[PDB]
Amino acid sequence: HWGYGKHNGPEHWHKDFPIAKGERQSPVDIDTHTAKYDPSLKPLSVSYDQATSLRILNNGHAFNVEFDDSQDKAVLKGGPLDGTYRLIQFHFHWGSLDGQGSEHTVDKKKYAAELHLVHWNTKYGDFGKAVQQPDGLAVLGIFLKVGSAKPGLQKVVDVLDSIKTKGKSADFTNFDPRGLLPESLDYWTYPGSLTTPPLLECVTWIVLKEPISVSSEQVLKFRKLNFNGEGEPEELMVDNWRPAQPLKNRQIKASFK
Ligand SMILES: [Zn+2]
Torsion of CA 23, 26, 32, 35, to 10 degrees: 40
One-letter amino acid of 88: I
Question: 80 with 44: CB under 8 angstroms?
Answer: no
The reply to whether 61 belongs to the active site is yes
Q: Calculate the alpha carbon distances from 135 to 61, 88, 127, 198 in Å.
A: 25, 16, 12, 16
Bind-site residues: 91, 93, 116, 195-196
Using DSSP's 3-state secondary structure scheme, residue 163 falls into helix
Binding residues for Zn(2+), by number, are: 91, 93, 116
DSSP alpha helix (H) spans, 55-147: 127-130
Q: Which of 7, 61, 104, 119 is catalytic?
A: 61
Pair 192, 124: CB distance under 8 Å: no
Whether 78 contacts 187, CB under 8 Å:
no
β-bridge mates for residue 212, sequence order? 144
Q: Which domains does the chain have, with CATH numbers?
A: 1-257 (3.10.200.10)
- Ligand 1 centre distance from Cα of residue 231 (Å): 27
Task: Identify the experimental approach.
Answer: X-ray
Is the Cβ–Cβ distance between 67 and 51 less than 8 Å?
yes
